[PDB]
Amino acid sequence: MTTRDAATIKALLSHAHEAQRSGDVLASERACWRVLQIAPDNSEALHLLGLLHGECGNYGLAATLLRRAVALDPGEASYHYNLGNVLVASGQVERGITSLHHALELRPDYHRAHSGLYVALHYSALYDPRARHILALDWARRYADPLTPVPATPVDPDPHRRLRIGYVSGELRCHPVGYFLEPVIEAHDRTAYEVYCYSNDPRSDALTDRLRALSDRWRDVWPLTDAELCELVRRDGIDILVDLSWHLGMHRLFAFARRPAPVQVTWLAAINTTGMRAMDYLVGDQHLCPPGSDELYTERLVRLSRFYLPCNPPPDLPGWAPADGFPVFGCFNRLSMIGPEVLDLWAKILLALPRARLRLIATGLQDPVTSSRLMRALEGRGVAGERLELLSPMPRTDLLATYNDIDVALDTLPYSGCTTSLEALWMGVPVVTLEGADMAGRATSSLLRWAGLQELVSRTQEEYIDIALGLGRDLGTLARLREHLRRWLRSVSMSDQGSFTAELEDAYRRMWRDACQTAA
Ligand SMILES: O=c1ccn([C@@H]2O[C@H](COP(=O)(O)OP(=O)(O)O)[C@@H](O)[C@H]2O)c(=O)[nH]1
Secondary structure, eight states: OOOOHHHHHHHHHHHHHHHHTTTTTHHHHHHHHHHHHHHHHHHHHHHHHHHHHHHHOOOHHHHHHHHHHHOOTTOHHHHHHOOOOOOOHTTTTHHHHHHHHHHHHOOOTTTHHHHHHHHHHGTTTTTHHHHHHHHHHHHHHHTGGGGGGOOOOSSSSOOOOOHHHHHEEOSSSSHHHHHHHHHHHHHHHTTTEEEEEEEEEEEOOOHHHHHHHSSSHHHOOSSHHHHHHHHHHHHHHHHEEEEEGGGGSOHHHHHHHHSSSSSEEEEEEEEOOOOOOOOEEEEETTSSSTTGGGOOOSSSEEEEOSSSSOOOOTTTOOOOOOOOOOEEEEOOGGGGGGGGHHHHHHHHHHSTTTOOEEEETTTTTTHHHHHHHHHHHHTTTTTOOEEEEEEEOOHHHHHHGGGGSEEEEOOSSSSSSSSHHHHHHHOOOOEEEOOOGGGGGGGHHHHHHHHTTTGGGSSSHHHHHHHHHHHHHOHHHHHHHHHHHHHHHHHHHHHHHHHHHHHHHHHHHHHHHHHTTOOO
């Protein structure tokens, strides 16, 4: 006789895939375990448990589930793809890049692995701006530019009429994207603009409920094809469509590829070009996007004369403590951003201030394997591993509150942080950064320059060290900077929401004028 197993597995395996596509993680996981109880060499279920734990941040389990899936079926490109992403996210950038290469070698038309690879390069100093640029263009040429028509003249090209703005993202939720979009959506001038949001992910938390309520129109987009989304955007009559996700998120750039709107913009998540002809504008700022940078972008750079994001803090802000070995340095950035280049500098700072402690908080630090590897990485640079204190990730306000126990924040290179740096300043903690010759290494350099704190902005790695040393020694400059931030916080709490979105609206208007104008 034979067994009904194969049928039971298949029903569990499709149920598991539905559960994960709809957002129900705990249900997809338990179904994957049920498959492995019956058939523990099932590489499809190993793989899916791999993804889910990778999304949850358990990179230790994730990686070994995905490596076992690779061993059982090494020809399957998607198993290599997802292993590469886990490895990059865990801090092992070069090992992940290799895995991403394998996925492309096995399936040369893998558009998600090609993006992932493009993204991954920004976490490594080994790939210059020319290499990243080329790979992006290569992607666009393959998957985007074939779909793109020539720019048509806008419908009802009235330079002064009320404009419809469409925000397209798959991280409209408790997430940097959602955090910076909320103020913009609330403060948009309804006399001159109308706000459509296109949510490209099913996860709907308290912030999505707020974004939905603040939007004029909503639209849940994840179940639609790119062609279906295009005919939806066209029917809504969107004048300016905005890519909030970029290559880093659950984007919808093949819908953008077709030019459903006459003005198409990438903003907020972008750290480099999309590579696409179909993207007209990228919205940055004057410090963020350096003078000779434009040749690196298919989009036209829009250098706003303020910081490229709204800096007003949330209402539920923990509020500052009276302060409290000194000094405690801090870096609450993703592990992908903490590689060999940064660790070399952080070690040199810790040798020169032999009592100072470094405090990292990120996803993956719950696993002993990844915290051990980080401790050992520092000991190899002559720094005792006990001086390094690693913490598992926390809720937003709980994390904000732990800045009270930090004297100075350190920013990553070559991929500069952004929202962690802003969060630090909100809690009266100064941030030391390197200004890279590169948009991806300038999110903090810009922020700091626009907030008056140019003295915390190094142009060289040895200057980075010196600034961090200077702050660890002098209590006075710390108390000066803590007050500068107290005044800045209040100023930004009051004006910055409306001040920013007016400057952005000014940019949207000039994009629109120019679209109508050149039809004459
Ligand atoms: O343990 C953590 C770490 C981060 N975050 C939040 O998620 C964001 C992720 O920032 P990231 O680590 O990607 O660095 P960034 O790119 O903002 O510099 C932060 O701003 C925090 O608000 C959190 O809730 N818990």
